[PDB]
Design a binder for this molecule. Structure first.
Ligand SMILES: [Cu+2]
Ligand SMILES: [Zn+2]
Length: 474
């Protein structure tokens, strides 16, 4: 007998096909059957008429490394229909690193003494012993490796340092990591050469992981940054993932036509993937960057002056008698929101066939960017339904079947008999992002229920208490 059957709704199976009326039966952690299940014995038959039953959403780009440990409920994500998170992005992973004051942007994951894992396996063991509500597919970050090995980060690494990082990377992959990420855009790795990155990531071909990256530059020199990424992919002969694709700065608006053309061409000869979030503003560490600081900038958190959280940097700078760029040093470490993208580009990038959906949420921020709470429903509601950017089945595919395939998450991302029971029940007519820049933590509308490995984790707009997540392997 099945444990339960979700009956009377429309199934959008995650393979990018129009929805069809069908029931979904679950037994244990597996989807036992799909179709007319009136003839199958079940302990419960849940009515989901008027709703859509789809695979659970996979967040391709998260910074939930530590949040998974400190807030197992994972409300910001499960309330949106997310059932699996990919961690350790942009070169930033919680482990391996025992440091009491990690350099920005590593501090985006810190709640105070959070970096206590000497080995990557110790981190994975912790997750398994006290599982979060969602599954976790973890990557190790290059900048974290640099911080753990190099006494001085403002220079290229020596052969001995490269060997040390490569050993740590290898141990992480052997322990279960699904890949390695880099973020040469940031201070900790700005001095890292392309060859340093290649040598540190060589274990990928032996273990079969992916290479993810926050490119060295996403503005004036984005073409060069794209080429470096493609080159790294060919040298390693491993798939590459371009994180949160965008063209930032007024002088780069409209250039998504150009960048997408380059990516499409690369996909013809090598393995390339990419993800993005549905907003015109970015967010990360407060940084002395003239392009990032060109437009409206809001503080998310500030260590030396906590009261600045939520304020407009222009006011702060002006009142201190300095430019936004010159006032940054005295306010660090801190975080911010940067309005430096244009709607047309965001829409073009989201619509681009292979683009997967990733939130890039920064969960520890005092006053966070709303993407943390509304990314997925904003794509299903605002963009798919209201603007008609793509049909619903395609919008779902972009956060389920496509993502599972690119990260190698076997038996997930599809509503198919035999696959794991990560599922979402939502109302297509009302699903929508409620979070706004003004009120960034509002819960999404239209999300009826969410299941992970067969257990309901979100019901009646609340965490059920089921710590059903598992550490996944590629
Ligand atoms: Cu990131
Ligand atoms: Zn990034």
């Amino acid at each position: 007998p099945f444990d339960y059957i979700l009956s009377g709704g429309t199934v959008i199976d995650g393979t990018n096909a129009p929805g069809r009326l069908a029931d979904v039966g679950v037994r244990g952690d597996r989807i036992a059957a799909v179709g007319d299940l009136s003839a199958s014995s079940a302990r419960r038959r849940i009515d989901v008429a008027g709703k859509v039953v789809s695979p659970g959403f996979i967040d391709s780009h998260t910074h939930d490394d530590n949040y998974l440990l400190k807030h197992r409920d994972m409300t910001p994500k499960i309330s949106q229909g997310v059932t699996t998170v990919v961690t350790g992005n942009c070169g930033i992973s919680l482990a391996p690193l025992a440091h009491a004051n990690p350099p920005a942007p590593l501090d985006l994951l810190d709640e105070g003494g959070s970096f206590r894992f000497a080995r990557f396996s110790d981190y994975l063991e912790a997750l398994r012993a006290a599982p979060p509500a969602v599954n976790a597919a973890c990557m190790v970050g290059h900048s974290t490796l640099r911080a753990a090995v190099m006494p001085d980060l403002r220079r290229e690494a020596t052969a001995d340092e490269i060997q040390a990082m490569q050993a740590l990377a290898d141990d992480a992959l052997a322990s279960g990591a699904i890949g390695i990420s880099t973020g040469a855009f940031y201070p900790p790795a700005a001095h890292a050469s392309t060859e340093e990155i290649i040598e540190v990531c060589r274990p990928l071909i032996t273990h079969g992981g992916v290479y993810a990256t926050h490119m060295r530059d996403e503005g004036e020199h984005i073409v060069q940054a794209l080429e470096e990424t493609f080159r790294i992919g060919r040298e390693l002969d491993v798939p590459v993932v371009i994180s949160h694709h965008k063209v930032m700065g007024k002088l780069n608006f409209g250039r998504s036509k150009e960048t997408l053309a380059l990516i499409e061409a690369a996909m013809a000869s090598q393995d390339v993937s990419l993800d993005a979030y549905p907003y015109v503003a970015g967010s990360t560490m407060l940084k002395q960057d003239r392009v990032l600081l060109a437009g409206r900038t809001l503080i998310t958190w500030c260590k030396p002056y906590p009261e600045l959280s939520g304020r407009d940097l222009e006011e702060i700078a002006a009142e201190r008698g300095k430019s936004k760029y010159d006032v940054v040093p005295e306010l660090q470490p801190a975080g911010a929101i940067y309005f430096m993208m244009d709607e047309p580009d965001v829409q073009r990038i989201l619509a681009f066939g292979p683009t997967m959906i990733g939130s890039a949420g920064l969960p520890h921020d005092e006053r966070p960017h709303p993407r943390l709470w509304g990314t997925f429903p904003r794509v299903l509601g605002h963009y798919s339904r209201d603007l008609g950017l793509f049909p619903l089945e395609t919008a779902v595919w972009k956060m389920t079947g496509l993502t599972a395939a690119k990260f190698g998450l076997a038996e997930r991302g599809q509503v198919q008999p035999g696959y794991y029971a990560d599922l979402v029940v939502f109302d297509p007519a009302t699903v929508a992002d409620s979070a706004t820049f003004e009120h960034p933590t509002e819960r999404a509308a239209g999300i009826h229920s969410v299941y992970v490995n067969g257990a309901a984790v979100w019901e009646d707009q609340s965490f059920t208490g089921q710590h059903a997540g598992r550490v996944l392997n590629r």
